[PDB]
Structure formats: structure tokens, C-alpha cells
Amino acid sequence: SGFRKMAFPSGKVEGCMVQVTCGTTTLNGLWLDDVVYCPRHVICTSEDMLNPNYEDLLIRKSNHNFLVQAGNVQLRVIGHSMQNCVLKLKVDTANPKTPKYKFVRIQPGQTFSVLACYNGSPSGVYQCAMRPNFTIKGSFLNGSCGSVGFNIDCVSFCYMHHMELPTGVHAGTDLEGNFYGPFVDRQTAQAAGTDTTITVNVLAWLYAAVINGDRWFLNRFTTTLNDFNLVAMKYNYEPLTQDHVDILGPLSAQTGIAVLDMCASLKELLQNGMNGRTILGSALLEDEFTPFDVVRQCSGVT
Amino acid sequence: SGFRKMAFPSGKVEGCMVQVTCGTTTLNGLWLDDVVYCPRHVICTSEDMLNPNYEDLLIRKSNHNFLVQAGNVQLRVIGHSMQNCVLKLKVDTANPKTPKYKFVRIQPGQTFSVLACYNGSPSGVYQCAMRPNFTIKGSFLNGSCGSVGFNIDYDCVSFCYMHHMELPTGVHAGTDLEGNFYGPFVDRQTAQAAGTDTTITVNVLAWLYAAVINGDRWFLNRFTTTLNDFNLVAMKYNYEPLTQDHVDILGPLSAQTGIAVLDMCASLKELLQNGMNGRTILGSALLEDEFTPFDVVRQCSGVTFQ
Numbered sequence: 258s259g260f261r262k263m264a265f266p267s268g269k270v271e272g273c274m275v276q277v278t279c280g281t282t283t284l285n286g287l288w289l290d291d292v293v294y295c296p297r298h299v300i301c302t303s304e305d306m307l308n309p310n311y312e313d314l315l316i317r318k319s320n321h322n323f324l325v326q327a328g329n330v331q332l333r334v335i336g337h338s339m340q341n342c343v344l345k346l347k348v349d350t351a352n353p354k355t356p357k358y359k360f361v362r363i364q365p366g367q368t369f370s371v372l373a374c375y376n377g378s379p380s381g382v383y384q385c386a387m388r389p390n391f392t393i394k395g396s397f398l399n400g401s402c403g404s405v406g407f408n409i410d411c412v413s414f415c416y417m418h419h420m421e422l423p424t425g426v427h428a429g430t431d432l433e434g435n436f437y438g439p440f441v442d443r444q445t446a447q448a449a450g451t452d453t454t455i456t457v458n459v460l461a462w463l464y465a466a467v468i469n470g471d472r473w474f475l476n477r478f479t480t481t482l483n484d485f486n487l488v489a490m491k492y493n494y495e496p497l498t499q500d501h502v503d504i505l506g507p508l509s510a511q512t513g514i515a516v517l518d519m520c521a522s523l524k525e526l527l528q529n530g531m532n533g534r535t536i537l538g539s540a541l542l543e544d545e546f547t548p549f550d551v552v553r554q555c556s557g558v559t
Numbered sequence: 560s561g562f563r564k565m566a567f568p569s570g571k572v573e574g575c576m577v578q579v580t581c582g583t584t585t586l587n588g589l590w591l592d593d594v595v596y597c598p599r600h601v602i603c604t605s606e607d608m609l610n611p612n613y614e615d616l617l618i619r620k621s622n623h624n625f626l627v628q629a630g631n632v633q634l635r636v637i638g639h640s641m642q643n644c645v646l647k648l649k650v651d652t653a654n655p656k657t658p659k660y661k662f663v664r665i666q667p668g669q670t671f672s673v674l675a676c677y678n679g680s681p682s683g684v685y686q687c688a689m690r691p692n693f694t695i696k697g698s699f700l701n702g703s704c705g706s707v708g709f710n711i712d713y714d715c716v717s718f719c720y721m722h723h724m725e726l727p728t729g730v731h732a733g734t735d736l737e738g739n740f741y742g743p744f745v746d747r748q749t750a751q752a753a754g755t756d757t758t759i760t761v762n763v764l765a766w767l768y769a770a771v772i773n774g775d776r777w778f779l780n781r782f783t784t785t786l787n788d789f790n791l792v793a794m795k796y797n798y799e800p801l802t803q804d805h806v807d808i809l810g811p812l813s814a815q816t817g818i819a820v821l822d823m824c825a826s827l828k829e830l831l832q833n834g835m836n837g838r839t840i841l842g843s844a845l846l847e848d849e850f851t852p853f854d855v856v857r858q859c860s861g862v863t864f865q
């Protein structure tokens with residue numbers, strides 16, 4: 258029993274973190290085989306950030322301009338290139354701790370663990386979701402750029418941290434250097450757009466609450482997908498698709514509660530509130546557990 | 560910016576997890592140097608649980624009645640002993656991935672990371688606190704016994720908890736790594752239950768300080784309080800008394816924000832009286848009590864967003 262925000266074990270990722278310095282900037286890099294990946298904005302001075310020509314700025318750098326440190330060992334850079342917004346530094350030593358891995362781009366609503374790092378040293382691990390507005394509500398300070406997000410499916414790397422937006426939420430890229438969301442690595446006015454609640458995840462968490470014995474919000478009613486979606490739109494919740502109904506299938510089978518029966522519970526909670534009650538100890542409807550996160554935690558997958 | 564439940568990176572502990580089997584029971588062990596530590600209830604059957612005599616159950620076992628598996632390798636047990644409620648199995652191979660470590664017994668209110676494991680393999684990592692009633696609100700299933708809790712502040716792993724059982728209310732009980740239970744719990748199937756719990760006041764105050772560091776002050780007010788009047792109020796909401804030692808540990812957060820500890824106590828008294836009026840604090844609609852003052856200093860910026 259119990260239900261917590263749970264991250265994946267981080268050991269396989271810890272052994273990949275290094276420190277990358279270019280000029281006066283120090284941030285984190287990811288060392289896999291003989292390549293170190295980090296944000297390409299490490300090559301910019303503050304003035305370069307206003308209107309950077311990354312191709313020209315990178316042409317002006319030499320391999321020597323990048324200092325890479327793995328613990329107390331200097332790794333010699335022998336080549337440099339960019340892929341989208343990620344800098345790739347070829348080094349003279351392959352990481353002997355490289356795990357089996359893939360680079361995976363995730364979709365909004367999906368969760369991942371973040372290994373927050375500073376000076377190439379792992380500091381902490383927490384769980385996040387990619388919001389519908391393509392930001393993440395992380396916990397990061399100056400020096401955290403290059404920290405990564407991942408799932409274990411093989412380590413699937415899905416996020417590299419690049420910047421904090423004015424509301425204090427975060428923006429970054431996949432490990433192929435493609436930003437999540439309409440954000441750029443240039444100093445210009447950027448902002449998080451209006452966000453919405455991840456409906457399929459709230460339904461997954463209501464299933465977690467039922468598995469854990471919390472059933473007060475169940476009722477005799479059902480709804481249709483059309484009627485439910487009209488309510489979701491009114492309350493700033495993402496539309497529920499038939500694919501979301503199918504992904505909730507395993508949790509619906511384990512509890513015996515049809516997805517449209519659970520939608521009638523969620524419709525009533527949105528229209529009436531909780532009446533002073535809590536669900537899994539929360540007074541808010543939680544949306545950062547996917548259906549797979551609930552199955553992983555309630556079944557003890559290792 | 561941001562504020563999350565933040566666990567320690569778990570790799571140093573992952574490299575210590577093994578599977579221990581005795582008879583038909585399999586659970587987790589912690590392999591440090593040439594010793595594997597695990598709950599001594601691994602030597603009980605279900606029937607033995609009502610009134611076990613662990614000395615009589617253990618004397619019947621040889622070293623080869625214990626199987627220890629580290630990954631796909633069998634470790635050979637060459638000695639065994641019991642220290643309080645922990646069984647220690649001496650093995651023929653030392654763990655080459657043993658980190659720098661120590662064993663510490665913690666007090667209620669302290670936090671730690673838990674690495675939940677099944678069959679000697681890690682499942683996930685989350686933060687927990689030792690509640691005032693000496694239980695932890697973990698997330699554990701059958702087979703999780705022997706999973707451990709720890710901190711890694713200065714590159715040294717401080718192990719503070721080993722999981723032994725789930726209580727009737729769904730909360731968890733266990734021991735330190737010397738085998739002494741937290742609280743009055745025993746490794747025998749009795750009518751023991753979690754006592755009424757209270758809220759960890761010093762931690763709520765630390766989290767309000769985190770909210771101010773991160774830029775929000777809506778919940779402050781023009782009042783102060785004496786420590787005794789604060790305690791008389793707090794206890795009426797089932798909050799733990801605040802001591803002068805707790806006031807001292809909040810000192811650095813008070814200095815960084817310019818808010819006196821007793822003035823933050825006045826704010827907490829008013830939040831308990833008023834609620835949040837539809838607002839949240841650090842994304843929460845309820846008051847959070849599982850971040851210590853040390854956890855806030857570890858995670859927050861050292862510069863307040865004024």
C-alpha cells in the first residue's frame with residue numbers, strides 16, 4: 258500500500274554525467290561511448306545570445322576551447338559538431354559505464370525522471386511530466402543546464418535541460434537537440450503558454466486511488482466520450498481520445514471499473530469539487546502519473 | 560526555480576542490493592563489504608509469526624540454508640548472526656561496489672530516500688519522512704522487505720532504515736541498520752497499530768520559507784507570537800510542538816528571507832485558521848511536512864526572489 262511520486266533508479270545515468278566548460282560557462286554533459294552531448298548554448302557569451310549565428314560561433318571554436326571533466330579526469334576533445342540544439346564533443350576515451358540506451362522523444366502527458374546535476378555531479382532525482390504546453394515544472398538552479406530526463410524501458414533519454422522561462426518552469430530538448438515546444442536557444446521574449454490538465458493521467462490516478470482503497474468519488478452513473486469531452490473543455494482539461502481509453506484498459510481491467518464509469522466520477526468532481534475531502538492525500542486532482550506509472554508502482558516492476 | 564520531492568541519486572545503493580532466500584521466503588538484503596544485512600523474519604514461516612522464538616528458529620539453520628544472489632551470481636554464506644531484528648550473513652565475496660557508508664539512527668521529522676526493491680532488484684526511488692508516530696508513509700508491496708532508506712549528503716551513504724512490514728493502516732514499520740525498530744513495533748504478528756500521527760511543524764515552517772525564497776509572500780501577516788502561545792495553538796490542530804532546537808535549525812532560512820522564526824510561526828497559525836482561499840503554496844493546496852530545513856537549503860537557491 259501507499260502511493261508516491263516515484264522516480265526510476267538513477268545509477269545507470271549517474272555514470273554518464275560530466276562537466277563541460279567553454280570560456281566562462283560551465284554546465285553538464287552526457288558522456289555515452291566516445292561522445293559528450295550538451296546544450297549548444299554553452300558556446301555563447303551573453304552578447305552572442307541576443308542574435309546568435311550558431312554555425313559561425315561554432316566555426317570560431319577549436320577542440321581545445323572545450324574542457325570536459327569526468328570526476329577528476331580531463332577528457333580530451335578530438336572533434337566537435339552540432340545536431341540541432343545539441344553540441345556533440347567527440348572525446349578520446351569511451352565511457353566504460355555507458356549503459357544500453359536509446360534517444361526517445363516523448364509526447365505531452367508523458368512522465369520521466371530527472372537527474373539534476375551541477376558541475377557534472379549528480380545532486381538529486383525527481384519525477385516530472387511534459388506539460389501540454391511543452392514546458393516541465395522542474396526544480397533547477399543556475400548551473401543545471403545539460404541535466405537529463407529519462408525512463409527505463411535500456412535507458413531511454415528523453416530530455417536535456419536548456420533554460421528557465423519567466424514563470425519559473427523549464428524548457429529543453431530531446432537528445433537529438435529538438436526543442437519541446439515553440440522555444441529557441443536565443444535571448445528573446447519567450448513565455449510558457451496557457452496550460453491544461455492531462456485528463457488521461459488524472460483518470461490513471463483515480464484508478465490508483467481505487468486500488469489503494471479510496472472509493473468515495475465512485476457513483477452509479479456513466480457518460481459518453483462526447484459528453485465527457487464537453488465537460489473537459491469547460492474545465493481546461495485535455496480531450497480524452499479513444500486511444501486514451503484503450504491505454505487505460507489494463508487499469509480498468511484490474512479494478513473492474515470501465516473508463517466511461519470513471520469519467521462520470523471525474524465529471525462530477527470537476528463540477529462539484531471535493532467537498533473538503535482528499536484523494537490519496539491530495540486536495541487537488543493529480544495529473545503527473547501516467548497509466549504505466551500506476552501499473553509500475555502498484556505491481557512492483559523492477 | 561521549482562520545488563519537488565527530491566531524492567538522492569540511488570546508484571551507490573543500487574550496487575548493494577541482493578536477494579536473500581531462506582526456505583520458501585525471498586526478500587532483499589543489503590550487501591556491504593562481506594556482510595549481507597536483512598530482516599531476521601526471513602527465517603519465519605507464516606505460523607511462526609504469532610510467537611516466534613528467533614534463537615530456536617536460527618539454531619536449526621546452517622550457512623547453506625541461506626541463498627544470496629547478486630545479479631546472476633550466487634554468493635556463498637560462511638557465517639550468520641542476529642543483531643536485534645537484523646540477520647547478518649557473512650559471505651565469501653566482498654561487494655566491490657561498496658560505497659563509503661555509515662549507519663545512523665534518525666529522529667522523527669527526518670527525511671530520507673527509499674530505494675524500493677523486489678527480488679534484489681531496484682524498482683524506484685522516492686522521499687519519505689520518519690513520522691512522529693514512528694511509521695513511514697511508504698509505497699511498498701509484498702516482497703519489498705529489506706529495502707532501505709538513506710541519505711547521501713557528503714558522498715557518504717548514511718543508511719537509516721530497513722523495511723520490515725506494513726501495518727493495518729497501510730503505513731510501514733522497520734528498523735535502523737543495527738536492527739532496532741523505530742517505535743514500539745516488533746517482528747511478531749501482534750495487534751500493534753500505528754498511533755495517532757501529528758504534523759511535523761518544523762518541516763511545514765521550512766517549506767513556507769522555501770515558498771518565500773522562491774518568491775511568494777501572500778501568507779505572511781503583521782503579527783508575531785511567543786513560542787508558548789504558538790505551541791498551545793499548534794497542538795489544537797494536531798501539530799507537533801516546536802522546540803528551541805527547531806527554532807535554531809530554521810535560523811539560516813530566517814536569515815536568508817529576513818523573516819523571524821516566530822513571525823513565520825504567526826503566518827502558520829493564520830494559515831491553519833484561514834486555509835488558502837483558493838491559492839496554492841509551491842503547487843500544493845495542503846501544508847507540506849516532509850521537507851526538513853536541511854532539505855530546503857539543499858534544494859533552494861541561496862538568493863531569495865525578493
Ligand SMILES: Cc1cncc(CC(=O)N2CCc3cc(Cl)c(Cl)cc3C2)c1
Binds near residue numbers: 400442
Ligand atoms: C534558475 C535556472 C534554472 N534552469 C536554468 C537556468 C539557466 C537559464 O535559464 N539561462 C542560462 C542559459 C540560457 C541560454 C539561452 Cl540560449 C537562453 Cl535563450 C536563455 C538562457 C537562460 C537557470
Ligand SMILES: Cc1cncc(CC(=O)N2CCc3cc(Cl)c(Cl)cc3C2)c1
Binds near residue numbers: 600699700726
Ligand atoms: C504490502 C506490503 C508492504 N510491505 C511489506 C509487506 C510484508 C508484510 O507486511 N508482512 C510480511 C512480513 C512480516 C513479518 C513479520 Cl515478523 C510481521 Cl509481524 C508481519 C509481516 C507482514 C507487505
Ligand SMILES: [Br-]
Binds near residue numbers: 477478479480
Ligand atoms: Br447514467
Ligand SMILES: [Br-]
Binds near residue numbers: 538539540541844845
Ligand atoms: Br495538495
Ligand SMILES: [Cl-]
Binds near residue numbers: 283284401
Ligand atoms: Cl546554465
Ligand SMILES: [Cl-]
Binds near residue numbers: 262383384
Ligand atoms: Cl514531486
Ligand SMILES: [Cl-]
Binds near residue numbers: 585586701702703704
Ligand atoms: Cl516480504
Ligand SMILES: [Cl-]
Binds near residue numbers: 712713
Ligand atoms: Cl553524513
Ligand code: NA
Binds near residue numbers: 477479519
Ligand atoms: Na460512475
